[PDB]
Every structure is written in C-alpha cells, then in structure tokens.
Design a protein around this ligand. Structure first.
Ligand SMILES: Cc1cc2nc3c(=O)[nH]c(=O)nc-3n(C[C@H](O)[C@H](O)[C@H](O)COP(=O)(O)OP(=O)(O)OC[C@H]3O[C@@H](n4cnc5c(N)ncnc54)[C@H](O)[C@@H]3O)c2cc1C
Ligand SMILES: Cc1cc2nc3c(=O)[nH]c(=O)nc-3n(C[C@H](O)[C@H](O)[C@H](O)COP(=O)(O)OP(=O)(O)OC[C@H]3O[C@@H](n4cnc5c(N)ncnc54)[C@H](O)[C@@H]3O)c2cc1C
Lengths: 607, 609
C-alpha cells in the first residue's frame, strides 16, 4: 500500500470511548449525523488518504512546483493535481463547512479527526483545499453584500490564501508596510510586497483565488491595531453571478526552495507592482484587521499542530511495521552466545524503548488535539465536559498554542526515533520517514514560531485570562488524581501537576516583579518555551492515564482479540510515559526557579 | 549559500594550547620538527581553504548529486566537487597525521582532528573520499612486509579506499555476513558476495585505484565475527613493484543509494565475483583476524563521524548567530506593551539568547570532548598533558570514542534544530545551509554503528570488561576539579550533583547486570537505560570541560585580557555557567528514571504496540 498508515481505531477510541462525542451526535446542530455515519466517514477518508492522496506524496517532493516568470504562475506536478481532484470530487474540502455554504454539520472534534488523514498522507493537499473554510470566515466577518460573494466562493470552490508576512514583518506582524488607498467608489488599492505566502498560486486547480490581505490604510495608526483586512481576488468577478472577469493586480513573483513541504507553493506576492491595481474590499467594511485575521490564524495554528501530530503517527506506524520484520542480532539474554538464534528487532530493549516513546507521544498528542477540539463547539463542551460557552472558548484558546507549539516540536523530535528504528535504511528516500522529518520541520515556524506560541500561552492565555482556563484544566487533572492499578501513575501525575504549578508561580513572580525591576521580565522569556513544553507533557500523561483507565474498564468487561491488544497498549503507554517522561519536569521546575539574567547581560560579542 | 562554512580556529587553539597544553609536546620527540607557530599556521591555512574552495561545492554536491551508470558500474561526481577534492589533494590535506614514512607530517592526533574538523564542517564527504591514505596506513600497520610495500605505493599515489562490512542481513550484526572467501592454490582468495551501503565504493576519476578492505568468511570458517577475515581487494590489479595499474578486478558497484543527505558521498551496493570475473583478495597480514583488524578502521571512522557532527553543529551555530545579530524583529521585552517602541535585533530576545547559548555551550563542549579524547590517542601526549601511561591512555580513548560518536551525533542533530529555529521561516529555505546541515548530519547516529550500538559498547566493553578503570580515572579528574577562587562555586556544586547522578546511573545499571545472574531478563533493564546513560556521561563531560575552560578564561581575564580576547573569555564563563544551570540538573531526573526501570515494556505483547 501507500506510505500513509492511518489509525482510525485510535481516533474512534478517543472520540467515543474517552470523550463521548457520540453523545451529541443525532441532537440539535448534529441532528442528522449519527455515530455510525461518523465512523463511516473516518474510514472513508482514511482510505482516500491511504489511496489517491498518499499516491502523490513522493512525486510532490521529487518533482516540485515550478514558477513561470512568463505568466507569473506556478505549475504543479500532474499526479498531485490528480490527488487534489480526488479530494474535491469527494467533497472533502467542505468538511465542517456551514450547511448554508454546502457543508455537513459536525463536531469540530470529528472534523479535525477527518483532516488528520489528509495531513498524514499529503498535508499540502489539505492546505490547497482550505478555500471553502476561508470563504466561511470571510462570510462570518463580511457585510451582507460580501456574504453573497463568500457564498459564491464556497460553492465554486475557490482557493484562498492568508497574506500577512513581509520581509521585515514576520513574528512582528504590526511592522508591515503594505499600504491601502481608498478609491472614490469605496474599493481600495493595495500596494506592497508580501513574503512566504502559501498557495499564492496553484496552477489550474481553481478558477479563482481569494487573497485575504492585511494592509495599513493611509493615515492609520501603527502596529497591528492599525491594520485592516482586505478581500483581494486573483480575478475580478461578477458580484451577482460569480462569472470570472479581468485579472486583478496581485501576482506571484517567486517560489521558495524549501527543505520540505515542497509541493506547497510558497510565494512572494506582489500587490499593485505590475501595472494594474490590486483592488481590495475592506472586510466587514470596518477597520479591524488583526482581530479578523486571527479568526484565520486560529484555524491555521490548529491545522499545523494536527499536521505535525498526523505525521508523527504515520512515522511511528511505519517504523513499527519495519521493526516487526527486521531480523538483526540475538536476544539480549543470549548476547554472549554467538550462535544464538537471530531475533526481530522488536526484541531489543532499546527498540522497544524507542517504539513506546513514539507510541506514547503520538497517541498522547492525538488525545490533546481531540480534547482541544471538544472545546471548539459550545454544544460539545456542554455535553461532554459540563462547561459553558465562555469557559469553553477560553480553554480552547489556552490549548491552541499547546497543539501548535508542543505538537510541532514534539512530532519532529520523536520522528528522530522513528527514523533510527530503520537503521541505515531510515536515511534512504526509499522510506518515507526522512520526508516526514523535512516536511514537519516547518511546523515549528509558520503560523507563529514556538517562541511566539509560548509567549501567547503565558501572556495572553494565562495572565490576561487571570488563569481561569488554566485553573479549570488543572482541576480536571487533580480530580483524576484524587480518584489501584493506576495508583503509581496517579502519584507521578501529582508530582507533575505540582511541578507545572511551581513553574507557573515562578514565571508569574518574574513577571509581577518586573513592575519594580524591568529586566525581571526577561526570566519569563527565558522560561516560557520550557513551560509550554512541560504543560504539554503533563497533558499527555494525564490523557494517556485517562485512556488507560478506560482500557482497564473494557478489559475487565471482557475485551478479546485485537481490542484486548489495543487496550493493553494503552495501559503500557500510560505507565511508560508516567515513569519515563513526567519526572523530568521536576528538574525543569528547579531550573525555572533558578533562572537568572546572566545570559541577558553578556556582551553580544561574547557569543 | 556557497560561503556557508564558518570556522572557529580561535576556539581550537584555545583548547589545544590554553586548556590542554598540547604545545608542550610540539618540538619534542616524535613532533621534533613541528613547533607551535607552525601548528597554528596550519589551522589557519586549512580553515581558509575549507571556507573557500572546499565549501564552494557544498551546495552543488547536494543539488547536483552523483549519477550512476549501471553498465560501466561507475559514478559521475559533479565537477565543482571534484575541483574541491583537487584543492584538498594539492595541499596535502589527505595526509594530515599520516606516518612520515608514508609521506605525512607527524603531529599529535589532537592537532590532526582539529585540522580535519574544517574539512568536515565545509564539505564532510570530501574528507571521507580523502581517507585513502589513512586506510593505507592501517593496511601498512596490519600487513606483511610485502603488503607494507603495496601500502606505501597506495599512500604515495593517493589511492582511495573503502571499508566493506555491511550486507542487507548484516548491519549492526556484522557477524551475520555471508560474503565468502575461496582460497586459491597460489595463496590469494576469491571473494564472492554482495555488500551494501559502501561509502565511496566508486568515486569517478578522483583516484587511479581504490583499496576495498573487505570482511568475508573463509570457506569452512566458524560463525559470527570471530570467523571473519579481512581482505585487500583492489579495484584494479596493479604491479606490486611499481604500482602501475593493471586489469580491472572483479569488484563492481551495482547500485547507488538515494539518501536524505550526504548526497555527494556515493553509497553503493558492491558486488564481488558476481560478473564472471574473480574478485581477488589478499589476506591482510596473512592471518585470520578480520574483526580485530577491521576495528582499527572502525575506531577511526567512529571518531570521524563524531567529529563530523560536532563540526557541523559549530558552523550551524555560527551561521545562526550571524543571522541573529542582523535580524530586526519586534520590541525589547521590557517595552512589549508599547507598540511604538524601537524595534530590536533578535539577539535582544530572551528565547533567542537561550537558543544561542544552548547552541554555543553544546558546540564548544563537544569540541572540547573530541579534542580531549584525541589527547589520549598518543601515549606521548597523554603522558605530557595528563600524566597517564600508555595502557590507561588507550583504555580512556576507548571509553571516550562512543561518547564522541554516540553523544556527538545525537547532540549535534538535536541542537541544529535550535540553529534552524533562530532564522525563523528563512531557516526552512535551502538558501541557508542549516537545513542541509540537518539532512547531512542525520546519518551520523546510524553509520559506523547506531547510537544503541555505541551505548552497548560503552557499557559492556568500555566499562564492565574494562573493570571500570578508565571510567574511574575520568571520574577522579572531575572530582578533583570539583574539590579545587569561589567564582565557580555554583558550577562546581552543580557538577558534583551531576557526577553523583552519573555514578548513581552506573551503579543501578551494574546492579541490573548482576541481577541477571539470577533472572536473565533483568539484563533488559541495562538495554533500556544504556542510551540515556551514554548521553548523561556526555552531558557531564561537556559541563566539566566547559567549567575547566571557564577557569582558564577567568585566569586570562584576571591577568588583563582586552578586546576580542576579553569577549571570547567572557563567553566561556557564560557558557559554563549556563550549561551547569540549565542542562546538568536534568541528570538528576534521569538517574531516578533509570533507578526505576522495569520490564513491563519488554513483557507487552508485540501486538499491543
Ligand atoms: C513554509 C512557510 C509558509 C508560510 N506561509 C505563510 C502564509 O501563507 N501567510 C503568511 O502570512 N505567512 C506565511 N509564512 C510566514 C511565517 O509565518 C513566518 O516565517 C513566521 O511567522 C516567522 O517569521 P519570520 O520568518 O520573519 O521570523 P522572525 O520573526 O524574524 O523570527 C526569527 C527568530 O526570532 C524569534 N523572535 C522573533 N520575534 C520574537 C519575539 N518578540 N520574542 C522572542 N523571539 C522572537 C523567532 O522565534 C525566531 O526564532 C510562511 C512561512 C514559511 C516558512
Ligand atoms: C550513508 C551510509 C553509509 C554507510 N557506509 C558504510 C560503509 O562504507 N561501510 C560499511 O561497512 N557500512 C556502511 N554503512 C552501514 C551502516 O553502518 C549500517 O547502516 C548500520 O550499522 C546499521 O545497520 P543496519 O542499517 O542494517 O540497521 P539494523 O542493524 O537493522 O538496525 C535497525 C535498528 O535496530 C537496532 N538494533 C540492531 N541491533 C541491535 C541490538 N543488538 N541491540 C539493540 N538495538 C539493535 C538499531 O540500533 C536500529 O535502531 C553505511 C550506512 C549508511 C546509512
């Protein structure tokens, strides 16, 4: 079969047996989507992903897109375009789209589980397919007239881009200098050069592309607060019928040569620089750009973390399948007998350590993003957690930088174990793990770097939130701890919870002390990413232990066969993670409690 | 990036001369005719050549990789890379540390590896192709008198060389190889088998001959590695008196791998005696002692791979630092609330300084480790700089090699992640060299023996079979540093805790080994902990050697260092202090983890994964 090895079984376990998402299926918004149909959709897209989507994974990397300066377009490899058509022909670009735009209403938890398969098999294919989802965001933020255009864009399946970055404005979005000049008729002319724009051209995949562009109206103030958001289509069109008209003045000028994710065209995007204006329409006809654009950034951050998690999962399952069959060496208990029988490498302790590390992190990370997603619908959060809409939104906002930051960093790090499991063969392009590594390196950088994630988590999702979402999650962990076969795990979780509490307290002290000693704030910066990572490890351990508690119940009820093996694996993973990953957080807390500004005072010339 | 390679001769000289005192042996005994000024000039010279002509083709070799012709069984290398190789040859850099009677310049191994570091940072496959004369010296040392004549010819003519062990079924388990050797009446052998993953098995027209050193099992020999013999199998027959090249020998490349990185190094399937022409081999030293003889080569390859990883992390760090110094993004964190504050360069941000100091401390701690290791590779150096005799020096060098290789490879690759991150989205571009550093360096945890194999070697052969004598020696030096100003008081306290942690790990693992006398399966816990223990010892050594460097730096600052010297020394103090406070404490948790290993993960059904 394909490079892509899916895990629908673990997704359904999470959705139904752990979080109980099936309790909202058939009711209210999801009135006409039942549990059986949800399961069938997951199986179907898993097969699509393993089949036609994964089919062009290698081709997209080995025969990457080409920029044509004669036409200012990008050409994509034919096999990848065929994969995209398989996604469109099945309507998978409308997963979770609103019903009035042509979608099937479903819990966000199911939506992201469906998307995981595309992100494991060929993640750029989902990225090119995000057009309808962007149309919905344009719809939500649009005027009544603009809602008519967004409806057309969804129905016609136009592609889309999110256009923020400039050479001098990446992390600091507010430094952007792309300009917006209002015209007599109320449209705007956008003038500027944007960088690193995903999908800025996409060959003949679509009849149009909606660029959602941040730009600064003439006379507006500085920073992100002075930015506005503009609908800038590649082609003008008839606002009533949708008929494609004249080219608009927004042109790709370059395609980047990247380590990985090569089939995703990443382009310099010039607005108003090629002799015709780039006409844009102010979104919602209000000046509120960074808030509006964050509707998109939130989804992109969720997507990036889920991509990284999807990629670790197929990396792990590839390594596991390889290890089961590779014969090498004798059993360690016979190591001095040079005539001892040769064994498969799953018999070697270091390989079992490696595989269980990969397994526990892959499944823990899957639990985290599905858990995060259960807070993205008010109805699901109410039904499965008993939490109201306001707290649910805050908890989702808390968890997003974990999914993105901790997901991105962990997946790339543990893929190292996946590749190592293949030995020298892991270094070959014949196997997919080296491409997994290259494709996933970008996940720590785009949609906000890890440092930006960690700063968001602490400054905005905890301090500005006055710790409400954080206290809620901590209370659920404490409840699980308070509650026999999981006594040792619960003790290790209690240490880990106290460690994270200590880190939060130290960092909060460093921030609060900055009012009298400005440089104190630097210790927050020094510790922020380690703190984010510690919270991710704590959440992984808790959710794995919760899974093991369910697995114990199902084994006690009489599970057999492949179910029994699955549940045994959950108990083993939970115990391994508690005993080998959580304790490190104690040393990390002590490190954070002793941070100093020596490294900030050092002359730059001494580095 | 063509001028991708950023060298650090200053840090090399600091280690060689101010810390370890390798200049004490320069101008005396074996190094009679090499003085400290010449050694420094050599470092500067190869560093310049590396930054120029050798680095020039780094990108080319990866973007325009070798092409295999299966009908001629040869590889074509890109022209720019062959021009880099010729610059290497024209300067004699393939003969660094070669024995004088083979045409080399005698020198401490610590200087030799510091010189080679520059090639490994600039274009590591170029050094690998250039290891022929080094191999010729190993062949010489293990050869008959007649073979020594051939080895002298091969060195003088600059022949390339390969080490040929691996087969599809015999990678970590070398002893599983099935390639066979059939004795001929005239005393030569015919080698029959297919080997895999052979580095440099063809090399276009770089050389007039290649020496394949091939492990094979004489017909009727016993199993495992002890049954293997080592054979000299030249690509071309040659005139044993003059070296004149003769008929093609029966050893042909039949495939060339497509790899994630290190692409310009042709990695080859090598077929011996499969094309109707015998692959004639000569039994090395005319004795049957294959695995022992080949480990002379493996030991050097493991040193090279570790030094390669370390060299690559160093130039990745310096590339990241130079980018960070110029990249303006965001406000100072003390002004984050003020959206009209001045924009600052990113070295002002705490997370970036954290990243950069993490990169620095590991790059420099790793450099200190490989150079420290090299000081035990000459008896004369180990005596002059450490006061240890030849037997202990060899055991210490053997102890440290799996650290250099296993800890060096894993650490360099992991910390290059920080280097790439420092560039932001630009770090994901091939326009910058970091993504190629990452791809080129991933292989270092795998070839010349995987990390797990390094950790098993370290524990069972270099500690237990050694009865702990080399490990006890190094521990004693760490303890003596701790026991000896109080400006390093906190660092010495942290080092003492780390030393106690590593001792605790060693005791727990040794405990599991003794328990295996009674319950065989207890040995698995040694396996589960072995790699974490190897990494822990590497962290301890890094922190100790950085603290030693800090003590030297404090002396030089106290004496009145100014300007760029002052900045250099200040950075050593900061690195040692940062590493002690942010890396070493984690070893406490790792000790407690190792103390609680169990066999649950061993007893789990494979079906449960
Ligand atoms: C493949 C790819 C696709 C992309 N697609 C898009 C797209 O479709 N749309 C779009 O708008 N953008 C896109 N981008 C841009 C991407 O979001 C930026 O690269 C990213 O936000 C980082 O910005 P930068 O590259 O300018 O790095 P910088 O902001 O210059 O960061 C450099 C380093 O400084 C650190 N740093 C910066 N500011 C701070 C701070 N205040 N505190 C602490 N550390 C800091 C960063 O963490 C990083 O380590 C893409 C980028 C890539 C690589
Ligand atoms: C680029 C490249 C160049 C190479 N060049 C050469 C060359 O010039 N000459 C040459 O002779 N070889 C060469 N090799 C071979 C290389 O040394 C082997 O790939 C390496 O030894 C690992 O062997 P293997 O690939 O068969 O992996 P395997 O031995 O199959 O290992 C697979 C996994 O099992 C683990 N494992 C295996 N045995 C044990 C054990 N007993 N205990 C615990 N874990 C175990 C490994 O650690 C790994 O995680 C090269 C390889 C590469 C990738």
């Amino acid at each position: 079969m394909s490079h892509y090895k899916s895990n629908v079984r673990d997704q359904v376990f999470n959705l139904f047996e752990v979080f109980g998402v099936d309790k909202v299926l058939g009711a209210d918004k999801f009135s006409d989507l039942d549990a059986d149909t949800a399961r069938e959709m997951l199986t179907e897209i898993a097969r699509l992903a393993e089949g036609p989507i994964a089919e062009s994974f290698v081709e997209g990397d080995r025969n990457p897109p080409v920029f044509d300066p004669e036409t200012h377009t990008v050409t994509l490899p034919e096999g990848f375009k065929k994969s995209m058509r398989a996604l469109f022909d099945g309507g998978w670009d409308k997963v979770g789209l609103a019903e009035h735009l042509g979608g099937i209403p479903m819990p966000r938890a199911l939506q992201w589980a469906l998307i995981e398969h595309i992100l494991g098999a060929n993640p750029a294919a989902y990225m090119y397919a995000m057009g309808p989802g962007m149309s919905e965001i344009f719809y939500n933020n649009g005027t009544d007239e603009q809602k008519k255009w967004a409806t057309i864009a969804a129905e016609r399946g136009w592609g889309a881009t999110m256009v923020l970055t400039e050479p001098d404005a990446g992390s600091d979005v507010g430094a952007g200098r792309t300009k917006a000049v209002q015209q007599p008729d109320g449209t705007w002319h956008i003038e500027g050069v944007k960088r690193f724009i995903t999908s800025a051209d996409s060959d003949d995949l679509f009849e149009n592309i909606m660029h959602l562009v941040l730009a600064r109206p003439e006379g507006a103030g500085p920073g992100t607060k002075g930015l506005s958001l503009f609908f800038v289509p590649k082609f003008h069109f008839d606002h009533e019928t949708g008929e494609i008209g004249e080219r608009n003045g927004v042109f790709v000028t370059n395609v980047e040569h990247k380590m990985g994710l090569k089939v995703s065209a990443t382009c310099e995007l010039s607005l108003g620089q090629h002799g015709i204006p780039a006409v844009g329409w102010l979104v919602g006809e209000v000046h509120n750009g960074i808030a509006q654009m964050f509707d998109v950034i939130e989804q992109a951050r969720m997507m990036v973390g889920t991509k990284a998690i999807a990629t670790l999962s197929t990396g792990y399952l590839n390594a596991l399948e390889y290890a089961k069959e590779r014969v090498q060496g004798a059993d360690m208990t016979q190591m001095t007998d040079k005539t001892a029988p040769r064994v498969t490498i799953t018999h070697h302790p270091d390989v079992r350590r490696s595989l269980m590390t990969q397994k526990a992190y892959a499944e823990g990370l899957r639990a985290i993003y599905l858990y995060t997603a259960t807070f993205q619908d008010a109805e699901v959060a109410q039904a499965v957690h008993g939490v109201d809409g306001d707290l649910a939104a805050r908890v989702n906002d808390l968890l997003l930088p974990i999914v993105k930051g901790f997901g991105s960093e962990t997946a790339y790090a543990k893929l190292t174990e996946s590749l190592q499991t293949l030995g020298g063969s892991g270094f070959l392009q014949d196997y997919p793990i080296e491409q997994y590594i290259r494709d996933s390196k970008i996940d720590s950088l785009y949609a906000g770097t890890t440092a930006i994630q960690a700063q968001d988590f602490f400054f905005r999702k905890i301090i500005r939130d006055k710790g409400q979402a954080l206290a809620y999650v901590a209370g659920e962990i404490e409840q699980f701890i308070k509650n026999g076969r999981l006594k040792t795990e619960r003790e290790l979780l209690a240490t880990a919870l106290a460690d994270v509490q200590g880190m939060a307290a130290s960092l909060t002290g460093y921030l609060m002390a900055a009012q009298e000693d400005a440089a104190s704030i630097y210790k927050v910066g020094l510790g922020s990413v380690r703190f984010l990572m510690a919270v991710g490890d704590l959440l992984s351990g808790w959710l794995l232990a919760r899974q093991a508690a369910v697995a114990i119940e199902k084994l006690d009820a009489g599970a057999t066969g492949a179910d029994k093996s699955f549940y045994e694996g959950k108990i083993a993973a939970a115990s391994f993670f508690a005993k080998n990953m959580l304790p490190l957080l104690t040393s990390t807390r002590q490190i954070i409690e002793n941070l100093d500004n020596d490294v900030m005072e050092l002359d730059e010339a001494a580095f």
